[PDB]
Design a protein around this motif. Structure first.
Motif, short mmCIF file in Angstrom:
data_model
loop_
_atom_site.label_atom_id
_atom_site.label_comp_id
_atom_site.label_asym_id
_atom_site.label_seq_id
_atom_site.Cartn_x
_atom_site.Cartn_y
_atom_site.Cartn_z
N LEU A 10 16.34 -22.45 -5.43
CA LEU A 10 16.26 -22.01 -4.20
C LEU A 10 15.67 -20.95 -4.03
N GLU B 437 27.49 0.95 14.78
CA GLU B 437 29.08 0.81 14.99
C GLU B 437 28.74 -0.20 13.50
N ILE B 438 27.92 0.11 12.16
CA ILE B 438 27.87 -1.26 11.79
C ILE B 438 28.53 -1.91 10.93
N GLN B 442 31.96 -2.73 3.70
CA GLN B 442 31.15 -4.37 3.68
C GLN B 442 29.77 -3.85 4.05
N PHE C 67 16.44 -29.42 -2.76
CA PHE C 67 17.02 -28.57 -3.36
C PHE C 67 18.03 -27.56 -2.77
N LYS C 68 16.91 -27.34 -2.04
CA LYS C 68 17.62 -26.43 -0.32
C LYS C 68 18.47 -26.83 0.33
N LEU C 72 25.49 -26.35 -2.43
CA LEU C 72 25.16 -25.12 -2.68
C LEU C 72 24.37 -24.26 -2.85
N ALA C 73 23.58 -24.73 -1.37
CA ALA C 73 22.27 -24.40 -0.37
C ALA C 73 22.80 -23.59 0.40
N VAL C 76 25.54 -20.88 0.02
CA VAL C 76 24.91 -19.41 0.08
C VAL C 76 24.43 -18.99 0.81
N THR C 80 25.94 -15.91 2.21
CA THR C 80 25.02 -14.75 2.40
C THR C 80 25.89 -14.25 4.47
N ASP C 81 25.53 -15.22 5.45
CA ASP C 81 26.40 -15.38 6.33
C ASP C 81 27.11 -14.23 7.36
N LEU C 83 29.14 -12.83 4.44
CA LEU C 83 29.23 -11.10 4.21
C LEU C 83 28.10 -10.02 5.32
N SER C 84 27.71 -10.88 5.68
CA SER C 84 26.70 -9.57 6.20
C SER C 84 27.64 -9.97 8.08
N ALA C 86 29.88 -9.66 8.51
CA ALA C 86 32.11 -8.94 8.21
C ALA C 86 30.83 -7.31 8.49
N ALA C 87 29.69 -7.44 7.45
CA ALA C 87 29.03 -5.77 7.70
C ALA C 87 28.63 -5.34 8.96
N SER C 88 27.54 -6.53 9.80
CA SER C 88 27.27 -6.00 10.86
C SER C 88 28.02 -4.90 11.77
N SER C 89 29.10 -5.55 12.23
CA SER C 89 30.30 -4.88 13.01
C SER C 89 31.40 -4.68 12.70
N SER C 91 33.29 -7.42 14.21
CA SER C 91 33.13 -9.60 15.08
C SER C 91 34.01 -9.66 14.58
#
Lengths: 49, 702, 97, 49, 48
Positions: A10, B437-438, B442, C67-68, C72-73, C76, C80-81, C83-84, C86-89, C91
């Motif tokens: 992947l 504001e990160i 998380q 595969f991509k 599953l590709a 995942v 990741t998007d 989680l990022s 949620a961690a970005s601001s 939102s």
């Protein structure tokens, strides 16, 4: 086991799409193809009149 | 986490060499020109095509001489005047191209200088205040110099269309002798463009006689063609341009003998299952105007069982040598973009490439020892038929810069290239923002899952696929900055230290033992105004360990993991970025971060802490500010053990121990950098640890 | 000087799955886990297969292609998007439980 | 008859093997140890060239 | 052969793991023991 297997199959999407562009642009840049008749002359009776 | 992520980023440099050499090999790329350029000529027919002079005092042009012709005075209007040129030509394969040397307006011509080239390629322009033209045969691009009057005003005059090419490509000219992307989810909208398209092929051919009795044939080949058509699609009478091109063509040579009665063709071109055909569109619809930024582009097309007809050969004696038949199957496989210059109207278009396949019928040459050929030949493929129609659908999901206002549809394309963009310097401030504001827990969670560059480079949603060869060219370009060179220096120092028992181990400075991890750090740096001598050694040991280890190994969560997590948070919430704008941001975030952060290594209930700020700390749990530092002891025991990233430094751990209590298990998992307890303290009661993590993530400045 | 290169029509996927299950009812166990604790090389995973004529290379590239695009590709990728994001601001602050 | 060439580069590799032996005769003895914890990856092991 | 030089029960434990660079290199750097000869002949045997 498959941790690194299914990891790598992947992660290298970059390799695969770079290969796609590499083969495409190579196909664009392919050169001419020439054949040699081989070690055999070809002739006959030319001045038909 | 990101230790192996940056290690993967640095490891996969084995592609930029290949992905760039392919760019080199695939990106080679009457009209009186101005100065400081080049001119290349590829004549079609043997004769007079290109002339040139300063039309005042010195005339210098060049004339082709037909082979198998003795010294004969021609009747050619050299500079419009039939000048006497009596030159032989006894060569067989490599032709002659002789410069006529004329003095005055109605001047006489002497003979000096002849150009030899088989593939019909020549290049002539003035260089360095003088006429520097290529001479000699094919193997070497040797040039010659010709002095005139009024150098910078010599009037090149061709009769066909040729190259505009600058001077500074002398290497490129000698070798000849021998895409705009702005993709983002914020203010960019997809549109449905699924238009069923019909296109018509057309073929043109290059036939070139050899000067003689007609029994010698030089060049019968394809050549690009372009007609137009009008289509009655959905009640719209749409006009469309089209072109043709071939690649990977096959060469056949039908040599019958030597004496001039032999029906000999020096070569023949024929298409088989190694070639492709390319076409373009110039339509009137909006979808034509909306091919400047294409998200996805697919098109299924129907197949045409194209054939070839009867062909031509005019020979003096005997009946007519008849070549017949042609066959190939058209199968489109691959759709790309391109441009086309027709009448200085060079704008965008789209290209279709096809796979090809021959058919059963033979293609025969009469009275020739040749029969049952395969592949549609290059003599007269058009069969008199006007066009070769191909139908089918055509999908386009192109994406224009639609404004934030949903009610406003963008329906055009402003220009050829949008050449304003935005520079990295101003981008730095908009990356200096979005760090306020990160998140609070998380982003620490994001600092755990391996952010392998697939998942790193999959949610970006770009319009091309060259983002990742670039994403490794970024580490090829840290050579300009201070990471790639730093890794190289680490490895080279540890290698030549591992090979020099003669002087490379004794002439270097002191550490704790014979280790390149101690003395290489303390070699030469400016002394800080107010620091101690041991502070410098600790700071240099810290810098080399902080930068090198972040990409080698560590215990627990590392600062580069936080760097990668916040980097992904910025890129996902960027709202202003271009595909060719991260090649700087990822660099100056993998480097210009980590300004001053310490690490630790534990020795059997004894740990020290030191970072690149001039401060060190010797203290082991169980009440702090203990027995002072031991530089060489700590130097050896950190060279000998993998390092633990000190996310919690001396002040923060002291504050959290003295103020709001701690337990032995929690303290242990803290100072060995176990992310579990760090994030559980962060998430629970908003501790001084939260202030520390926040001020740490603002330390990711630019 | 051939008319058509005979493309080998490939047996339909459902039957394929059937003999694959019929094969799975034949494998062994102890040396299977012996294989299962050895991190293999993406090299021998596609090394000894067929005819070594620009085809193990092509099949490796094609399986990388396919595969991509799998579940599953993109799974995942979207994990990741999310989680990022949620961690970005803040939102997705609070929509429902 | 002018297509018979078969062997290549042995004349150089053979003579340089002993040169690498002779230089490695005097290798160091401790810095090999700390140049073993390093993941000398392709970006590195093909950078000191 | 080394056990003439003691190095017992914790350097033994890690040296039986054969691979702890800390213990190996600390034996290397100060005790001038048999191990330098062992590793030197290791280098000389990969030599040819």
């Amino acid at each position: 086991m498959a941790s690194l297997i299914y990891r790598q199959l992947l992660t290298n999407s970059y390799t695969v799409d770079l290969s796609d562009e590499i083969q495409e642009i190579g196909s664009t840049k392919s050169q001419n193809v020439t054949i040699n008749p081989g070690p055999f002359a070809q002739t006959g009776y030319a001045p038909v009149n | 986490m990101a230790s192996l992520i940056y290690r993967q980023l640095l490891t996969n440099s084995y592609t930029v060499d290949l992905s760039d050499e392919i760019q080199e090999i695939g990106s080679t790329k009457t009209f009186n020109p101005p100065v400081d350029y080049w001119m290349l000529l590829a004549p079609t027919t043997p004769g007079v095509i290109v002339e040139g002079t300063n039309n005042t005092d010195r005339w210098l042009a060049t004339i082709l001489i037909e082979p198998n012709v003795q010294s004969e005075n021609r009747t050619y209007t050299i500079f419009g005047i039939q000048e006497q040129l009596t030159v032989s030509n006894t060569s067989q394969d490599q032709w002659k191209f002789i410069d006529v040397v004329k003095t005055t307006a109605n001047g006489s011509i002497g003979q000096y200088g002849s150009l030899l080239s088989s593939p019909k390629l020549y290049a002539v322009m003035k260089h360095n205040e003088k006429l520097y033209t290529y001479e000699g045969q094919t193997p070497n691009a040797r040039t010659g110099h010709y002095s005139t009057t009024n150098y910078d005003s010599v009037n090149m005059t061709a009769f066909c269309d040729f190259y505009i090419i600058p001077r500074s490509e002398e290497s490129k000219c000698t070798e000849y002798i021998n895409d705009i992307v702005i993709s983002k989810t914020s203010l960019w909208k997809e549109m449905q463009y699924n238009r069923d398209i019909t296109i018509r092929f057309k073929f043109a051919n290059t036939i070139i006689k050899s000067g003689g009795l007609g029994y010698k044939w030089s060049e019968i080949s394809f050549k690009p063609a372009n007609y137009q058509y009008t289509y009655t699609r959905d009640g719209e009478e749409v006009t469309a341009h089209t072109t043709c091109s071939v690649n990977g063509v096959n060469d056949f040579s039908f040599n019958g003998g030597s004496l001039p009665t032999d029906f000999v063709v020096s070569k023949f071109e024929v298409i088989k299952e190694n070639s492709y055909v390319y076409i373009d569109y110039w339509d009137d619809s909006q979808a034509f105007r909306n091919v400047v930024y294409v998200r996805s582009l697919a098109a299924n097309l129907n197949s045409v069982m194209c054939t070839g007809g009867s062909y031509n050969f005019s020979l003096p004696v005997g009946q007519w040598p008849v070549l017949t038949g042609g066959a190939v199957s058209l199968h489109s496989a691959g759709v790309t973009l391109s441009t086309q210059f027709t009448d200085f109207v060079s704008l965008n278009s789209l290209r279709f490439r096809f796979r090809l396949a021959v058919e059963e019928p033979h293609f025969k040459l009469t009275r020739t020892r040749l029969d049952r050929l395969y592949g549609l030949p290059a003599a007269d493929p058009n069969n008199g038929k006007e066009y070769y129609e191909i139908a089918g659908r055509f999908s386009l999901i192109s994406l224009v810069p639609s404004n934030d206002d949903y009610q406003t549809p963008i329906a055009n394309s402003v220009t050829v290239r949008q050449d304003l963009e935005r520079q990295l310097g101003e981008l730095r401030e908009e990356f200096n923002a979005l760090s306020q504001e990160i998140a609070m827990s998380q982003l620490i969670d994001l600092a755990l899952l391996p952010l392998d560059m697939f998942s790193m480079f999959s949610g970006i949603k770009s319009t091309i696929d060259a983002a990742k060869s670039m994403a490794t060219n970024v580490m090829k370009k840290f050579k300009k900055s201070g990471l790639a060179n730093s890794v190289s220096t680490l490895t080279d120092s540890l290698s030549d230290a591992a090979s020099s028992i003669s002087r490379g181990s004794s002439i270097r400075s002191i550490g704790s033992s014979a280790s390149a991890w101690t003395d290489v750090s303390t070699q030469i740096t400016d002394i800080s105004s107010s620091v101690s001598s041991v502070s410098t050694q600790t700071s240099t040991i810290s810098r080399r360990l902080r930068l090198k280890e972040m990409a080698t190994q560590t215990e627990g969560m590392n600062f580069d993991d936080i760097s990668a997590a916040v980097l992904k948070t910025k890129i996902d919430k960027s709202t202003q970025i271009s595909p060719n704008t991260i090649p700087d941001i990822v660099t100056e975030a993998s480097e210009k971060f980590i300004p001053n952060r310490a690490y630790r290594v534990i020795n059997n209930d004894d740990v020290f802490e030191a970072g690149i700020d001039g401060k060190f700390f010797a203290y082991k749990v169980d009440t702090f500010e203990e027995i002072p530092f031991d530089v060489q002891k700590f130097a050896d025991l950190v060279t000998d053990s993998p390092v633990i990233s000190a996310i919690i430094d001396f002040k923060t751990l002291k504050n959290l121990n003295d103020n709001y209590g701690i337990t032995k298990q929690q303290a242990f998992n803290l100072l060995r950098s176990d992310p579990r307890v760090l994030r559980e303290f962060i998430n629970q009661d908003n501790p001084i640890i939260r202030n520390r993590i926040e001020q740490l993530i603002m330390q990711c400045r630019l």
